[PDB]
Symmetry: C3
Subunit: 198 residues, 3 copies
Amino acid sequence: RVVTQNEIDRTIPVGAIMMWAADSLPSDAWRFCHGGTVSASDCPLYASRIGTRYGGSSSNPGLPDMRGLFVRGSGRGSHLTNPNVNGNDQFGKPRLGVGCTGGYVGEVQKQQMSYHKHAGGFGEYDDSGAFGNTRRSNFVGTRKGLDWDNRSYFTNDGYEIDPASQRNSRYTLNRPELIGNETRPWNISLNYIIKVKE
Amino acid sequence: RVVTQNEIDRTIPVGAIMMWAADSLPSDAWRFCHGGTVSASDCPLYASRIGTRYGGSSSNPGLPDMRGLFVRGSGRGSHLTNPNVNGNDQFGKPRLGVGCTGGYVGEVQKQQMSYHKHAGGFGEYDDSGAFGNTRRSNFVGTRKGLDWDNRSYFTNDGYEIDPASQRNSRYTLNRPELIGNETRPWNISLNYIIKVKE
Amino acid sequence: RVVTQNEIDRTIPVGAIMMWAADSLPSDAWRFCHGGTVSASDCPLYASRIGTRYGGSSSNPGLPDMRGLFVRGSGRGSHLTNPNVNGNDQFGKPRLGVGCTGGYVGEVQKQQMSYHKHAGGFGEYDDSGAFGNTRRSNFVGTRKGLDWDNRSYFTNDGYEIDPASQRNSRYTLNRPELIGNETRPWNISLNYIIKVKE
Ligand SMILES: [Zn+2]
């Protein structure tokens, strides 16, 4: 059977986004998601379906600016709402779905890390750590001079303190370059492209 | 040359997933990945290629529910298996590829953060921190009353303890809103759509 | 209007990447991003547009190997460059855009977490924590034997120290399975596919 023009938008609707493995595009059917605009007269289905939700004006609708961004599904689906990943576990700690959701379509979220604790390098005999404690074992502390009206002294920020040339295993906090400015998984950077006209 | 119907599935095969920049779809060729079902008689190539791997039944195959989820490649490829990002570094710490992999196709993984350490706000002269230590320098500790049969006292969970109105630089632990319920990178939320019929 | 062959590449250009919800592909128009190669004579537009940027040779151009990887947009766009997510906040801490960027197209980044601090389980009266401190309140410390030429003792790595069967709420550091080998958000694993020929 021979294919007609109405099947084009059916196959890839204007408004759709995919990835692109190079730096330039071969045709004006697609545009980069780099925050430009399109002309509404040039791209009437983009103007009608997307409008100004990514900025611009009705005459020159905005394109998404996805440079630097990861993508997640909008909303919160069955893998996140399952009761078995919500509520608190047997130790009273929230399960890993709690507080995790996509936004509305087009919403941008900043980097974040879950709250979490570490066991400290000092402590005492009583079961009275401000934020919890281990069982008693081979751990240092003092028997002298304890009182309970002090400050909590902060840990450092996870970067190394001593120079690499003077460290060994026990003077090194972390896996190499794990701590930095950004929370993000292993990833490849690609361009995102959006379909704007037939 | 004129295009025939067999080239449709060639160009975008049923089973393919991309992103969508709005809240509704213009045709029934695509469906949202929101965990619905399709009819197998309506969508025979979806029924044959995908079947019940995302749930549903043979008569009404399930759609993926990608709401709230990021996407990674299934498996573990050259960027993760390269020996230069595996094994231990010169300080005995596992390199950043270790333990990092995609799952099988359709597998869902929960949020996670790598193990890591911080330098503590207290310590002693001996090279005997339970979890390691720095070199000796301008760091507080006590010379009195040490013993080694105590508990380790936990750090807090990274949220601020004192109110913003009473903090300054040194009373503030973290970058603003960095700590929260979720580990995730900077991202935009979009819909995912799957091709279900011609 | 009847559709001709030149509209194929227009609709989905060779070089485009999307996702795939199964384990095999129905036609040779697309290939998995599993690090293979294609033949340049079989796939001349792939050879001309992509060349050897993902490896291989001019005669047999390489395919991306996206197995295990997430995707982010290349570059750094308006959501990351906005002055209101850069610079330092009122406490002198860098806002959450600082240091966050996509790479060049095809660049791979390793997992990372932002630097951050926790409040320690010990401290003293003076406003002199090496890495900061809270206000004075109900916090343990010693009044005896302080000096300032010690080491900083490290925290542990966030994994639990005591066995689950012997823990309760206050002996448990973290949300269940939050700490592991990998920093990554909630996600689904899928195949990535790239368009290589008409
Ligand atoms: Zn930490």
